[PDB]
Design a protein around this nucleic acid. Structure first.
Ligand SMILES: [Mg+2]
Ligand SMILES: [Mg+2]
Ligand SMILES: [Mg+2]
Ligand SMILES: [Mg+2]
Ligand SMILES: [Mg+2]
Ligand SMILES: [Mg+2]
Ligand SMILES: [Mg+2]
Lengths: 202, 396, 128
RNA sequence: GGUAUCGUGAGGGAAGUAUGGGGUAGUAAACUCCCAUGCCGUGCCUCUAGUUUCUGGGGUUUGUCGAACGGCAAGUGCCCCGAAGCCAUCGCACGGUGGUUCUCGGCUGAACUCUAAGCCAGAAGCCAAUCCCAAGACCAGAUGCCCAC
RNA sequence: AAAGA
RNA sequence: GCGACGUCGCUUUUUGAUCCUUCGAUGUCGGCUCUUCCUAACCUAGCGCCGCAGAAGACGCUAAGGGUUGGAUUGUUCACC
RNA sequence: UUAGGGAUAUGUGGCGUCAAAACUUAUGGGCUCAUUCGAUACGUGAAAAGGGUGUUGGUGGAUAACAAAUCCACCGGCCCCGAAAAUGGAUGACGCU
């Protein structure tokens, strides 16, 4: 019944991506996010660890359990970067936030939910790579908390390989098409082979 | 300028009533897969205290010398009946249970725990699980999740409850069964269910979990005091005698800024009945029951015959009838409150925590008095056939 | 050092069990004490304190001088588990380094003050 | 749906810290430790101490029930002792952990030296963790039991 | 979450 | 290590101004009590360095984490022992 | 600079999200890495000399040898230190490199 545009965030810079996701959530689309671990940020890790340890330093003096609740686990750091790029104190903006999910890695319920999506206008590599220091967000958040880097680094390893078991099994099911579709020429009306060639789809 | 070290410890806030009297290990030890599968926790009942005399070791000044009187605590520890096995996934939002196999029988005291009346009830707890276990799909749906506790599971936790009908103590007014998950800290989780699957529906006695001269950590719930004031709850100070509106207060609980009272200033509220842990409480004796060895408190230098139970029981508890455990020092309970032992976190490699012990004396002199007599058969020796028994042992 | 209960806060008049002339040992301050807030410096059984003599010879009176507690009228629990105490407070008057200074003690010096002062025990009639 | 039990733990809290000693060693002096103590912290009540409306048991004082016995009145007469409970740095127990980085000693050498890239290493430090709280983090955690219509 | 795919 | 001569940045528990807020009322210093915060580091903590052989000081940097007393006279802050 | 409305178009200010507008312009010229970068005037002023053995620019003057190129002196910052406080903490927020 629903339609979710399951986005991906490997090698997406944390901010050029939360700005694009926020405006789409705010255009009523329901984005689910995966692999917030691999989100990149400009600058070295030390600089990005201090830009976050200076935020882990702010808390309501008189009652910290009301202060700004800091989140490890990049999955919601990406949700945190989005909530901040968003009209929070309207029901319009709280609906837009509640349309993200922002998992960690590719959970089993969104590996088999269809192909997934990337934002080219935020991929850090629209061009050559010079030398510049980027930081995987899952590696900056391991160092300020987020006990579960080991956990998801193995769940996603038992998947990047379990999927690779299914790209080479059912590999002999693929060429059963790219050959059948290849020799799906020269047996059929030239009437149509000519316009497949014309429009390149040959 | 002038100041003092701050009153109380901010790492025990909020000073709140613990969510249950049952002492519950928040964290179990780190899983060293180089060990054998075993049980790393156990629930005992605080009988009370006494003190003992020890042959000392660990050469120092007060040590390597004559004996010492050290206060101890007697914790009655009946064997625990394992009922279940519980495995956890290591998922990125923290452990989650992946099923729970139960035993085929489930003691009638365990099933009370899923009630609050149990005598107007119809006792249906675990009715479709005893029935469905005798099925074949039961055995399927049970080995379908035991064959899961090896694929997906990392943490394996049996569910043990206490034997209370085996705890003839009455002053423990409860007949439900205290239910506690217990970590297994062996290795090769495949061989970790093997233990769990084995000792399931079998009694686990405390010496099977612990050894005599080693130390545990005691997860427990402090003795409650209700609403205690600031001088008692935090121990701040009494204002001078001259104070108006009385003197058991904190005078200044806030500057002008911040214009809110801080979470750090002292205020009156729940004191006691908090969950504490008491790291590194060292076991001095883990002696067995009087039903099996009615010479509990006679080690080698008290060749007389006696038991742990002092003259006239422990005050407010009763007689110890089960496999008591003798710790060293304080335990954060009132009498007959369930304590949970736990094998400790600390490296524990020290000449003050790994040294073995022999107890040259234990006191059974009555708690209720001053007691001058051990082993009441010494009291009869002091006195004579006085008129109480004289009116019965000479009137026949 | 020992786990001796403290008995003699600053301003206590201990009497001199040492035949040096003095009679009192108004405790000026405990030598070795690490300050704590509003806490009066409290001497103990083995502690060395600084004193002014309030009664006795004048050749030692209007002067700050040292003293080691002999006897403690406050019951301290010995680590052997025996709670023990004395009729009366008492202190020898001593060298600034620590030395006996005064005719052998007229009282039962306690164990907690002899094995912290090898120069007192050799002048004390009994040890207890 | 209810009810019940067991957990999970996002997040917030957070604490242990001083001093002496022995030790090898008047050694081209300290340092894993061994030993205490002190403070702080959290507990506890076995002991010691305090506390007594167990007005417990006793004693005593004026008055008072005809007098003893027995009590009673003196807003608990006073006194000695007093279990239980509570409580004391007055008693007692406990509070010695892994990474990460910078000072930094340094490595390779370019364009000879630590760094321009490649890099070990480690005191605090921070960071989790132990520890305290616990899904208004709304737990598709697991589990027990069950309706009418 | 499934498992198939 | 600072000192001639000098100067130049940043300093408030500063000496005073200013008269902006308050005149149908922001109640006066100091304490007591208690909590917090900062470092321009007093102590412990980390090397560094000297005419730093041991000893023992010497200069320095890094660190706010922990610690920083009890009294006499004074209303005191300060000061003094 | 101001009656009540609609449309067209601008002003100042802008066009990554909040936030309408480059759905992150096919942008072009250089600059910039900054362990508190930097980023809307007037808010009050942000940082003062000072130097370097630093990254980019310019002029005086050698060698044809530095340890086929390599120098001796300075002008110019962006940028490094100089420089610091007290509730938690602000380009307005996120964030951007
Ligand atoms: Mg008054
Ligand atoms: Mg936590
Ligand atoms: Mg946390
Ligand atoms: Mg005032
Ligand atoms: Mg005073
Ligand atoms: Mg228009
Ligand atoms: Mg450009």
């Amino acid at each position: 019944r629903p339609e979710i545009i399951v986005i991906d965030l490997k090698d997406h810079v944390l901010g050029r991506a939360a700005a694009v996701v926020a405006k789409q959530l705010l255009l009523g689309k329901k984005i689910t996010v995966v692999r917030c671990e691999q989100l990149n940020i400009a600058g070295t890790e030390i600089r990005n660890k201090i830009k976050y340890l200076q935020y882990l330093r702010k808390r309501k003096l008189t009652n910290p359990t009301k202060g700004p609740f800091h989140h490890r686990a990049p999955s919601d750091v990406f949700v945190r970067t989005v909530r901040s790029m968003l009209p929070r104190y309207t029901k319009r903006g709280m609906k837009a936030l509640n349309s993200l999910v922002a998992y960690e890695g590719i959970p089993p319920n969104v590996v088999r939910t269809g192909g997934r999506v990337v934002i080219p206008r935020a991929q850090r590599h629209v061009c050559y790579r010079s030398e510049r220091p980027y930081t995987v967000l899952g590696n900056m958040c391991k160092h300020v908390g987020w006990k579960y880097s080991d956990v998801v680094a193995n769940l996603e390893k038992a998947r990047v390989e379990k999927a690779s078991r299914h790209h080479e099994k059912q590999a002999k099911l693929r060429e059963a098409w790219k050959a059948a579709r290849k020799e799906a020429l020269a047996k059929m009306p030239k009437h149509n082979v000519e316009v497949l060639k014309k429009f390149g789809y040959a | 300028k002038f100041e003092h070290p701050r009153h109380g410890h901010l790492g025990f806030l909020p000073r709140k009533r613990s969510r249950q009297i049952r002492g519950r290990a928040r964290a179990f030890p780190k899983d060293d897969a180089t060990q054998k599968p075993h049980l790393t926790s156990f629930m005992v009942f605080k009988a009370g205290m006494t003190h003992i005399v020890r042959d000392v070791d660990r050469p120092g000044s007060k040590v390597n010398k004559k004996e010492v009187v050290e206060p101890v605590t007697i914790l009655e520890a009946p064997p625990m009946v394992i009922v279940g096995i519980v495995g956890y996934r290591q998922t990125p939002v923290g452990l989650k249970t992946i099923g729970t196999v139960w035993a085929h029988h489930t003691s009638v005291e365990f099933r009370r725990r899923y009630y609050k009346n149990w005598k107007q009830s119809a006792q249906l707890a675990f009715s479709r699980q005893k029935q469905f276990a005798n099925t074949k799909e039961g055995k399927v749906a049970e080995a379908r999740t035991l064959n899961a506790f090896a694929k997906k599971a990392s943490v394996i936790r049996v569910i043990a409850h206490t034997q209370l009908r085996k705890l003839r103590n009455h002053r423990v007014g409860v007949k439900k069964a205290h239910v506690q998950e217990i970590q297994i800290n062996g290795g090769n989780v495949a061989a970790k269910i093997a233990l769990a699957k084995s000792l399931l529906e079998k009694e686990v006695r405390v010496d099977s979990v612990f050894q005599q001269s080693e130390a545990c950590d005691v997860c427990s719930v402090t003795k409650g005091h209700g609403t205690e004031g600031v001088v008692k709850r935090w121990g701040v100070a009494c204002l001078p005698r001259k104070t108006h509106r009385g003197l058991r207060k904190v005078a200044c609980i806030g500057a002008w800024h911040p214009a809110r009272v801080m979470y750090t200033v002292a205020r009156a509220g729940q004191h006691g009945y908090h969950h504490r842990t008491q790291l590194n409480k060292k076991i001095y004796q883990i002696g067995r029951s009087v039903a099996v060895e009615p010479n509990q408190a006679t080690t080698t230098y008290d060749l007389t015959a006696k038991t742990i139970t002092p003259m006239g029981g422990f005050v407010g508890y009763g007689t110890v009838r089960n496999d008591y455990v003798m710790l060293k020092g304080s335990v954060s309970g009132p009498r007959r409150r369930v304590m949970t032992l736990r094998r400790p976190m600390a490296p524990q490699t020290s000449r003050h925590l790994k040294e073995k012990i022999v107890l040259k004396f234990i006191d059974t002199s009555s708690k209720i008095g001053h007691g001058r007599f051990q082993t009441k058969k010494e009291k009869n020796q002091w006195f004579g056939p006085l008129k109480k028994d004289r009116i019965r042992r000479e009137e026949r | 050092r020992f786990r001796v209960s403290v008995a003699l806060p600053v301003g206590a008049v201990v009497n001199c069990a040492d035949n040096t002339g003095a009679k009192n040992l108004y405790v000026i301050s405990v030598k070795g004490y690490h300050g704590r807030l509003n806490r009066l410096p409290s001497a103990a059984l083995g502690d060395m304190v600084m004193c002014s003599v309030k009664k006795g010879k004048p050749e030692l009176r209007k002067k700050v001088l040292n003293a080691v507690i002999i006897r403690q009228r406050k019951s301290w629990r010995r680590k052997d588990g025996t709670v023990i105490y004395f009729e009366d407070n008492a202190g020898v008057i001593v060298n600034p380094k620590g030395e006996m200074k005064g005719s052998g003690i007229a009282g039962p010096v306690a164990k907690e003050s002899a094995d912290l002062w090898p120069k007192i025990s050799t002048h004390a009639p009994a040890i207890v």
